[PDB]
Design a binder for these strands. Structure first.
Ligand SMILES: [Mg+2]
Ligand SMILES: [Mg+2]
Ligand SMILES: [Mg+2]
Ligand SMILES: [Mg+2]
Ligand SMILES: [Mg+2]
Ligand SMILES: [Mg+2]
Ligand SMILES: [Mg+2]
Ligand SMILES: [Mg+2]
Ligand SMILES: [Mg+2]
Ligand SMILES: [Mg+2]
Ligand SMILES: [Mg+2]
Lengths: 159, 59, 50, 50, 173, 186, 191, 51
RNA sequence: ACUAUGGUUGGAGACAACAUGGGAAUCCGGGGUGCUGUAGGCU
RNA sequence: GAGAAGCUCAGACGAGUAGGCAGGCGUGGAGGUUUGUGACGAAGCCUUGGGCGUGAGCCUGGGUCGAACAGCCUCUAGUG
RNA sequence: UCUAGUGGGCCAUUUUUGGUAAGCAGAACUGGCGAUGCGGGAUGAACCGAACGUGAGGUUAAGGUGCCGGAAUGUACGCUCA
RNA sequence: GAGUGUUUAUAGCCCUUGUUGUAAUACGUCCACUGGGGACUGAGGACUGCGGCUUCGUGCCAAGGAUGCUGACAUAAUGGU
């Protein structure tokens, strides 16, 4: 009871979203991909050509090659006791840029914007992110906000 | 009875010598690239090396 | 080293007194002083290795 | 420099608590056990273990 | 050893409501950690708040104002049995609300095999008038001319000669 | 109990030569002292290589020494070349330049040709006297992976390594699995 | 006790459940009458078979009719046998109902005068069912969703339109003109 | 060097080697030398005794 | 509602409660009923 | 000096079948060495005595006995 | 880099499928036994606790403290007669 | 001698506020505050260190690990088998 055809068990994985069938938005074809870009793989069931295998659906990797209609994407997959370099040729309908990559780009930009300004003002810059610190001391007032005393409620059937 | 598959110890075995990651190199083989890109890159790189050689020598 | 130790002692005692004074002030006014959350925790392992 | 200072300190090798633990160690402190966060009661436990 | 605490807490302020309301409970717990945990247990079933999205702003132990005055304590509880949920009312004579509450927990353990987790204390009130006492076994203790013999204990022999294995004579009541 | 996982527990290196050569023991004695009583990485390098096996101490020829010390941007003009190993001759180098070399062993032909060209040959103890910390020295090694076994290591499908075969020619592993006309290629 | 296994194209060869009638009494009643509802709820997760339900409904119909008649009750069976229990023949064997905790098994709305009678009939059916069940009195009007106090106010304002057994409850949604005409006595107050 | 660990909390000479400040350390300072007011408040006490 | 984690917890079991955490759907109610780029026309 | 194959200071750690490696113990025979042991008692054997080693094993008192035998560095195997 | 053993597993928790059920068969996750002694569960491969060099002292876990048996015929409030 | 029916009488109780208050006490927490009883251990072996105290000196100390003072036995005792 187990077939190993390419698209076995992809019944929901390769479905277009509800009320998202039909036309493919043409901005997908106008995106530019360069070697070193970090892309997400997300299979469009409406484009049967250039389909990556279902293992790569929802995976993120680096573009190593650019062709007319496709990109080569480097993906590491565990195959035992080690990761293996996989090179998947994907048509650009199944690919999108990682949104964190622009977030990392902008954070670095803001880091150097802070660093240069801190240098000129002759002060520290403190470019390190920090985990959410313990909450600080405050002074909750009760004027016009008097405490309400609660009690546990008695049991009663609501059917 | 044969056909006795189980994955119970297999994950433990994989982690004994860990999930190894492949070595990352500065340069990857251009045999994975488009052949037209690869052919022209040979000429571009050859000219860059020639130009770097001349400028050092003529300095 | 002795001078540094003395200043640390004064610092610990000063922080402790301010906590008492802030709590007393809040009780007097009927408001609430929410103290600073701890920055330090000590962790003890209570289970063996099985 | 907490990170460098704390890491420099070898993990403390405490004894078993003088006076023992609560009846069942391995339920939560809120449930009358010993596991998990116990707030300032970590100090009484350390006295027995130090 | 239970203690009574007042606990005051609130939802952490957000942009939608920057002045969340303050809610107070009186809770019987062995320590402050359990008191705060019980506060969030009871607040979660009334308000859309968790410990992660709330904060405790005050906690104070409440001592008994008149620990030397014998009182009558009426306690309303809600408890889970093996088959269902019930509300019941019990009355206890004590000098502290803590003492009555400890009496109630022992009483529910003995008579219904009800554990601590299965009991919610709805209210603890000091009953002032004689007729408001609903149990006769309690209001008979409010008689000025109340008299009874000493209850049957296993006698008493100091602390040391009670450790003696052999006695020269049989005991006499 | 303690939960310690131990991977790099025992050091994997030699702490002494496997050789029983008494004179090698004397050289180790000299360089144990020098590597301990100086701050020189050169002396620790010599001590470590004095322990190594024959396969880990490949030879180097005087041609390679002459080439390595005569690069266009070298400045390795009048400096002593040092190898913990054998210095062989390269008869293809018809004219040997003037070289200063310190080595464990010199081949008879290598030693004769170095001297005849006005150069000098030193043992490692003579080197220790001249440059006790290896200053202004070219420390060199032979090619570790030039030996035959490295033609074969890693043989496998599409690895382009050499097979172990008793004989070479057609009929000796050039058929099914080695060409497209016979099932598949490698 | 596997995952639900109903009749389907993959399970065409199925027996019919032994109960086919789920509605009894004055099924075509109204909203003014039968104002009090009693429910028999399942207290545990049981697997009441169609035989056990069929037995209960026959017993409930006979006792209730003899004691109060036909016009004073609206007995209905909430549980439906849709799970198929298999067997090896001497393959599907029977139909059972998977009821969770607090699932109503039989609901009867009667007069408040028949409050004691409705309790007793619903009490007897516990001997036919497996597991444990409890008798509770609904806080809702008959088979509606509203409390008796609220339903009275909706009835006194004039926003309730009787439609067979059930009814139509006004809402602040849809074209006004249809809402106006349909509710004659109701006051569409202008705020 | 260091053949036997000595607890500074028990060995006073070792406690002097570490912590030079221990000699001058003054515990049990009296700060309640004044009139000692009471800080409870009317609102606090009426909230405290509710129910 | 569901759920990760916990107990020599309850219960014959079915399940349930509690403890340290995560946290819906649906219905119902209020509000809304296109925004925008390029290039050029227009009392 | 401290068999530099030596000397010295410190810290952590310790289950193990199948299996792997290292360092040792014991046996027959070979080269070398030890002004080696021995009819004034070799080897072997017995022991209700002693000593050494974590152990494989080793040394020794007493008894019996009668012709050979051992230590150290190496070689070797029909070696427990 | 070279090479050994192995290629019959089994138990528990939790998620399950088949089966009337099973000390049943088959899969998922983790911990175990196999290769794990020790304290506890009278007993016991797998449950609880805890994983082990030879020892001195101290303190504990799980579990106990009428006697067998080391340790309160301890304290407090009830319930229960079989 | 049993029942009433009025708020200190010839008693008492409950609930509010003033001081003599910096009341005590309990509990919690801390003291580089302090006083005793019991047991196991004594690794190391010239010196060197960090401290303290000093009459400032190759001095003293509880400060990089036990010494001191006594007694009895010695075909006993302790060890071994
Ligand atoms: Mg004790
Ligand atoms: Mg315990
Ligand atoms: Mg669970
Ligand atoms: Mg457990
Ligand atoms: Mg071992
Ligand atoms: Mg032989
Ligand atoms: Mg003899
Ligand atoms: Mg014998
Ligand atoms: Mg020994
Ligand atoms: Mg043999
Ligand atoms: Mg005993």
């Amino acid at each position: 009871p187990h077939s190993y055809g390419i698209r076995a068990r992809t019944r929901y994985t390769f479905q277009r979203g509800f009320r998202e069938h039909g036309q493919i938005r043409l901005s997908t074809y106008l995106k530019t991909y360069k070697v070193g870009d970090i892309v997400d793989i997300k299979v469009n069931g409406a484009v049967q050509k250039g389909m990556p295998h279902k293992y790569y659906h929802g995976k993120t990797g680096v573009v190593y090659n650019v062709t007319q209609s496709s990109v080569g994407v480097l993906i590491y997959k565990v195959v035992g006791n080690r990761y293996m370099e996989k090179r998947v040729n994907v048509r650009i309908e199944h690919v999108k840029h990682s949104k964190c990559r622009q977030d990392f780009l902008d954070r670095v930009k803001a880091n150097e914007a802070k660093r240069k300004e801190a240098k000129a003002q002759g002060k520290t810059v403190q470019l390190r992110r920090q985990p959410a610190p313990p909450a600080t001391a405050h002074f909750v007032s009760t004027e016009n906000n008097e405490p309400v005393t609660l009690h546990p409620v008695a049991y009663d059937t609501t059917i | 009875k044969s056909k006795n598959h189980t994955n119970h110890n297999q994950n433990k075995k994989a982690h004994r010598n860990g999930i190894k990651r492949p070595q990352k190199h500065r340069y990857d083989s251009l045999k994975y690239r488009d052949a037209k890109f690869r052919r022209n890159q040979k000429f571009a790189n050859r000219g860059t090396v020639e130009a770097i050689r001349q400028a050092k020598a003529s300095a | 080293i002795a001078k540094r130790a003395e200043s640390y002692d004064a610092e610990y005692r000063k922080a402790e007194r301010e906590q008492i004074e802030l709590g007393r002030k809040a009780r007097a006014e009927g408001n609430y002083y929410v103290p600073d959350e701890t920055k330090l925790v000590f962790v003890i392992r209570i289970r063996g290795i099985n | 420099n907490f990170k460098q200072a704390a890491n420099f300190i070898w993990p403390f090798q405490l004894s078993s608590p003088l006076g023992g633990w609560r009846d069942r160690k391995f339920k939560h402190f809120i449930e009358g056990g010993d596991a998990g966060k116990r707030d300032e009661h970590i100090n009484s436990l350390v006295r027995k273990m130090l | 050893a239970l203690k009574e605490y007042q606990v005051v807490g609130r939802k952490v302020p957000t942009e939608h409501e920057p002045v969340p309301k303050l809610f107070r409970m009186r809770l019987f717990a062995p320590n402050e950690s359990v008191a705060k945990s019980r506060y969030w247990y009871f607040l979660k079933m009334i308000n859309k708040v968790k410990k992660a999205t709330g904060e405790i702003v005050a906690i104070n132990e409440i001592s008994e104002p008149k620990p030397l005055k014998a009182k009558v304590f009426g306690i309303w509880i809600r408890y889970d049995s093996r088959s269902g949920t019930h509300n019941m009312y019990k009355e206890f004579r004590d000098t502290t609300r803590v003492g009555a509450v400890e009496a109630m927990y022992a009483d529910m353990a003995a008579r219904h095999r009800a554990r601590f987790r299965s009991i919610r204390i709805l209210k603890v009130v000091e009953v002032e008038k004689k007729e408001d006492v609903r149990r006769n076994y309690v209001k008979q203790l409010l008689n000025p001319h109340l008299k009874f013999p000493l209850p049957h204990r296993r006698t008493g022999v100091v602390g040391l000669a009670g450790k003696k294995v052999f006695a020269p004579h049989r005991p006499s009541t | 109990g303690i939960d310690i996982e131990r991977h790099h527990v025992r050091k994997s290196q030699r702490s002494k030569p496997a050789s029983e050569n008494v004179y090698l023991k004397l050289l180790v004695k000299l360089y144990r002292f020098l590597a301990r009583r100086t701050d020189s990485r050169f002396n620790k390098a010599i001590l470590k290589r004095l322990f190594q096996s024959k396969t880990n101490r490949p030879p180097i020829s005087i041609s390679k020494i002459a080439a390595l010390t005569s690069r266009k941007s070298a400045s390795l003009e009048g400096k002593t070349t040092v190898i913990v190993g054998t210095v062989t001759d390269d008869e293809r180098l018809l004219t040997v330049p003037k070289l200063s070399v310190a080595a464990l062993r010199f081949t008879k032909s290598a030693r004769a040709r170095i001297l005849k060209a006005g150069g000098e040959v030193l043992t490692l103890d003579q080197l220790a006297l001249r440059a006790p910390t290896g200053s202004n020295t070219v420390l060199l090694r032979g090619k570790k992976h030039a030996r035959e076994a490295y033609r074969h290591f890693g043989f496998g499908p599409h690895k382009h390594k050499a097979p172990y075969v008793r004989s070479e020619g057609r009929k000796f592993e050039r058929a099914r699995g080695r060409r497209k006309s016979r099932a598949f290629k490698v | 006790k596997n995952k639900p296994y109903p009749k389907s194209r993959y399970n065409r060869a199925v027996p019919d459940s032994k109960i086919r009638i789920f509605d009894l009494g004055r099924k075509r009643a109204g909203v003014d009458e039968f104002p009090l509802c009693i429910h028999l709820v399942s207290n545990e997760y049981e697997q009441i078979t169609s035989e056990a339900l069929e037995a209960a409904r026959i017993c409930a119909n006979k006792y209730l009719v003899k004691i109060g008649g036909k016009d004073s009750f609206h007995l209905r069976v909430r549980a439906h046998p849709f799970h198929v229990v298999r067997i090896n023949k001497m393959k599907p064997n029977g139909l059972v109902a998977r009821v969770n905790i607090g699932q109503i098994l039989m609901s009867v709305r009667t007069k408040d005068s028949s409050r004691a009678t409705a309790i007793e009939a619903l009490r007897r059916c516990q001997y036919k069912f497996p597991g444990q069940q409890r008798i509770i009195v609904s806080k809702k009007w008959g088979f509606s969703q509203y409390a008796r106090d609220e339903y009275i106010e909706k009835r006194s304002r004039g926003e309730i339109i009787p439609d067979g057994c059930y009814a139509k409850f006004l809402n602040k949604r849809g074209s006004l003109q249809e809402k106006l005409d349909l509710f004659p006595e109701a006051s569409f107050n202008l705020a | 060097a260091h053949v036997q660990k000595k607890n500074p909390l028990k060995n006073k000479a070792v406690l002097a080697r570490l912590n030079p400040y221990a000699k001058a350390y003054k515990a049990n300072v009296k700060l309640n030398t004044g009139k000692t007011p009471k800080a409870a408040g009317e609102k606090f006490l009426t909230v405290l005794h509710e129910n």
